[PDB]
Design a protein around this ligand. Sequence first.
Ligand SMILES: O=C(O)[C@@]1(O)C[C@@H](O)[C@@H](O)[C@@H]([C@H](O)CO)O1
Length: 305
Amino acid sequence: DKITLRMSTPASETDQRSVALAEVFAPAVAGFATYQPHYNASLIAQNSELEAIASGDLEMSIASAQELAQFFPEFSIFATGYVHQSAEHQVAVFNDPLMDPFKKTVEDELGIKLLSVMYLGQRHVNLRQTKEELTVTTPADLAGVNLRMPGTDAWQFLGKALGANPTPMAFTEIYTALQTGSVDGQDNPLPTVVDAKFYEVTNQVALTGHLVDLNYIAFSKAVWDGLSPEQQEIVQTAADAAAQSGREKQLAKEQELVSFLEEQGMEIYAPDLDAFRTHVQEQYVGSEFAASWPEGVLDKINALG
Ligand SMILES: O=C(O)[C@@]1(O)C[C@@H](O)[C@@H](O)[C@@H]([C@H](O)CO)O1
């Protein structure tokens, strides 16, 4: 009997992360495990997947530092505006010994292994307003903008730190919120802007680049522990191979889609990034998030970039 591996994500079927797991991870483990993905948060709500793995109702998810920070506030360090520099930097950080205690905490306290880090992409402010209606140059320009952000404290804080007035909303609700004007904008990376067709209901992207964002491939520790050494090696290899494939494809999308978006009439332009970075840094000073970061870890992350 093969082990069933149920995976739940709010991501679509066509998202590069989903594709990588389905086309690279799934066939590699198929000899002993059957991958069973659920997209669009049909099975488990966004931000409830970790709990579902811990409670034996799910085996895998595409988790985030923000989701983990709900349980272990120190994970907020990996979800902090302007800290990660690139996809390559994320990999260096995840593989550095600094990550060891973070990984151990999740295993010991949630019964979940973080197998791999995946690249999600550069988050930017995507607004319904045209550039002429609202030009984003400094954080002051986002005053009073109702910016959707995902529903966790660290996510809301990031939206606030940009200068906007964040509102929490599940990923699957964004399109309709933009269509009806219940929010002014959202911040998913360009491949998602296209995949989810947010460009049909917005007019600009201000390239704030405020979070070079990532996910983790989360995997039940109970399942892992029941696998043979050979099977564990295959699962780890399959997860890393999927992350690597997805990363390359996501980066390619990120490069090519600017022109596609502009062809759809989107205005895509950079603000004053020095001004944004400086402002966001000072927003974190004095915050609960800053106080949760273990000694020396931020400096270590910086040095790896
Ligand atoms: O809700 C989102 O905007 C977000 O980008 C948050 C990410 O952590 C991740 O959960 C993502 C989903 O995978 C959908 O792409 O949604």
